[PDB]
Amino acid sequence: ATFEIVNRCSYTVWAAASKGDAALDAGGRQLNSGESWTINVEPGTNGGKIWARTDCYFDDSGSGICKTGDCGGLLRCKRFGRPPTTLAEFSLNQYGKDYIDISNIKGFNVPMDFSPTTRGCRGVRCAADIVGQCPAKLKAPGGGCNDACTVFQTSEYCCTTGKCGPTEYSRFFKRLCPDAFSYVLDKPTTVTCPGSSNYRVTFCPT
Secondary structure, rough: EEEEEEEOOOOOOOEEEEOOOEEEEEEEEEEOOOOOOEEEEOOOOOOOEEEEEEEEEEEEEEEEEEEOOOOOOOOOOOOOOOOOOOOEEEEEEEEEEEEEEEEEOOOOOEEEEEEEOOOOOOOEEOOOOOHHOOOOHOOOOOOEEEOHHHHHHHHHHOOOOOOOOOOHHHHHHHHOOOEOOOOOOOOOOEEEEEEOOOOOEEOOOO
């Protein structure tokens, strides 16, 4: 499957693509404002994620640091990134279908649209000013708006027992971005697309 990753933000982002134990394609790249990066994702990929990283510094070897979404100091991510990170999540070719969603379960850093470029389903978006409106206890100094699990590490926020409810903090994310997951047991906002669809992830869509 082809994913086109587009940075419409006015600032540079460092896109990342991983399935948690391996890079997807090159795993990461700098995107200046307006740039587009096309990656190929193997059919059958389960549990892939794409995200943006902000305020990164990398040396010649591709080692450094980012203020949001750092993936162990690497330009080319092999593992998932440090919150806060708005996530585009996908599982491809699962019994004939692809499944896509956007998640705020690991917080929010950059607004995002995740849409198919082929026919047969709808896209999803979270483009509200979550950082600007972020509750004071969830604000991350380096930028972004953390989820409550990251901040407080309780069974209720992290849904550790598999039983949890919405919270004041999850409802904040949900009010601003209804079509994104706000906590682990949220009513799913997953979209089912035809197997072997292609996609575009746009940072700062509006």
